[PDB]
Structure 1
Amino acid sequence: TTTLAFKFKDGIIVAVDSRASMGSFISSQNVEKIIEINKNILGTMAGGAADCLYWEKYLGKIIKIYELRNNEKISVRAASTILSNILYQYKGYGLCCGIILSGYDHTGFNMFYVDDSGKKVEGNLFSCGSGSTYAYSILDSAYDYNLNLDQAVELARNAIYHATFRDGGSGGKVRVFHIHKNGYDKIIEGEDVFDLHYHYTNPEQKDQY
């Protein structure tokens, strides 16, 4: 389980893997972590399976009603705050979820990490999940905010690879989305046998390390 975000020069690159494991066994490997909340705000599953799939669907219900009654598109900051509050009500009940409610509203490109304990926080370069430590590693040394869409998704895909390659609980197809001034387009609904692309380009050994 991994995730990214950038708020780079002209949008946001949310990127995740697609693995879902139960201890050691791999329950499934074609799971869609990215969740479309609004036409602009799009969440990200992580941590527990249901305890994050359900709420971002539940948060989907809350925004549809509000965005309908007031007929103004909700903002990320408002969307994040609603999520963290209902997530707070279940402190001791064992909910486990880390959600990066990236999106776009009238006030520019926002971004908000949310955790199961109402850990709402504004930022630029969040990443949650078991491999997030490696994901921060690659980004911080490469992230520039003046990247263009071409090499930004290359950087996002690059990080998700290095996380999945090094981490055990992360792997499988990598997704890399992007957020315009409106909407979002799935730039990569991709593959993951590409270690033999980045490093160890020519298959002749095992790439010992």
Structure 2
Amino acid sequence: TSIMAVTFKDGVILGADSRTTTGAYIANRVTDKLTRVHDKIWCCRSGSAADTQAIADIVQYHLELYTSQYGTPSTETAASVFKELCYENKDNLTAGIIVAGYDDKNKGEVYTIPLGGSVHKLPYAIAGSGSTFIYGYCDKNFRENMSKEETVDFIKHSLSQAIKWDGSSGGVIRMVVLTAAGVERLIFYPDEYEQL
């Protein structure tokens, strides 16, 4: 399973596969790993499936209230919420979340949280378990500050490699684009990158 997020000039573009294997039998193959936790701050889930979803519901409860009392959260804020649930039940709740989002004041930001629960800011992130095959590809051909067209190909091309080398990554490539223009979903079916 491969999850990623990349920062670019107009904001941040998120990227996921859709295969969730358990064992040898693929339970679901159209999984939507890209979750809205506010309305301009979306996340990416990887790892132990029930334990990531449980946390996400609680983070959603935290941010819906945060909005209603104190004002709109930031990428920073949301990631922090996430960390402190993984950190304080860090023996039994096993979660890798990439919190990506578009602020109207600081633009796109990416945070990566691995399984211990430590935040780290990054200009693109990769976490998962199918992202150990594309580590060297993602760093060499990535550029900070790419225009829009470029970004969408960068994340496609990586996931295409992830699909190829990792059999726990597959199906549709889902991308959610977070920008000031708004919130736009793109979907790329297999022939469209298996062509390359």
Using the size of structure 1 for normalisation, the TM-score is 0.87
| Whole-Å separation in 2 of the counterparts to 1:90 and 1:13 | 30
| Whole-Å separation in 1 of the counterparts to 2:128 and 2:90 | 19
CA change 1:42–1:196 in 2 (3 A) is closer
Identity of aligned residues (%): 25
Runs of 4+ in 1 over 4 A off after TM superposition: none
Task: Give CA-to-partner distance per residue, 1:101-147, whole Å, 9 cap, x none.
Answer: 00122333221111332121111111111111233332212211232
2:190 matched residue in structure 1: 192
1:85 matched residue in structure 2: 84
The number of residue pairs the alignment matches comes to 195
Is the Cα contact below 8 Å between 1:14 and 1:102 reproduced in 2?
yes
Matching of residue 171 in structure 1 with residue 131 in structure 2: no
Computing the radius of gyration over CA atoms, which structure comes out larger, 1 or 2?
Answer: 1
1:50 matched residue in structure 2: 50
CA change 1:73–1:195 in 2 (3 A) is closer
Is the Cα contact below 8 Å between 2:95 and 2:115 reproduced in 1?
yes
Unaligned runs of 5+ in 1: 199-209
Is the Cα contact below 8 Å between 2:40 and 2:102 reproduced in 1?
yes
Task: Give CA-to-partner distance per residue, 1:141-173, whole Å, 9 cap, x none.
Answer: 221123221121011111111001111211111
Is the Cα contact below 8 Å between 1:41 and 1:102 reproduced in 2?
yes
| Whole-Å separation in 2 of the counterparts to 1:4 and 1:137 | 14
Is the Cα contact below 8 Å between 1:176 and 1:189 reproduced in 2?
yes
1:1-209 equivalence runs, <5 A? 1-70=1-70, 72-93=71-92, 95-105=93-103, 106-181=105-180, 183-186=182-185, 188-194=186-192, 196-198=194-196
Task: Give CA-to-partner distance per residue, 1:14-44, whole Å, 9 cap, x none.
Answer: 1010011111111110100000111111111
Please state which structure has a larger fraction of its residues in strand. Answer: 2
Cα offset for 1:178?
Answer: 1.4
| Whole-Å separation in 1 of the counterparts to 2:14 and 2:191 | 20
Match of 1:103, SS state, is strand
| Whole-Å separation in 2 of the counterparts to 1:183 and 1:164 | 29
| Whole-Å separation in 2 of the counterparts to 1:33 and 1:23 | 19
Give the partner amino acid of 2:34.
Answer: I
CA change 1:140–1:91 in 2 (3 A) is same
Match of 2:168, SS state, is coil
Match of 1:134, SS state, is coil
Moved more, 59-68 or 172-181: 172-181
Is the Cα contact below 8 Å between 2:34 and 2:42 reproduced in 1?
yes
CA change 1:173–1:145 in 2 (3 A) is same
Is the Cα contact below 8 Å between 2:12 and 2:109 reproduced in 1?
no
Is the Cα contact below 8 Å between 1:84 and 1:116 reproduced in 2?
no
Cα offset for 1:56?
Answer: 1.5
Using the size of structure 2 for normalisation, the TM-score is 0.92
Cα offset for 1:175?
Answer: 0.7
Is the Cα contact below 8 Å between 1:4 and 1:135 reproduced in 2?
no
Is the Cα contact below 8 Å between 1:101 and 1:111 reproduced in 2?
yes
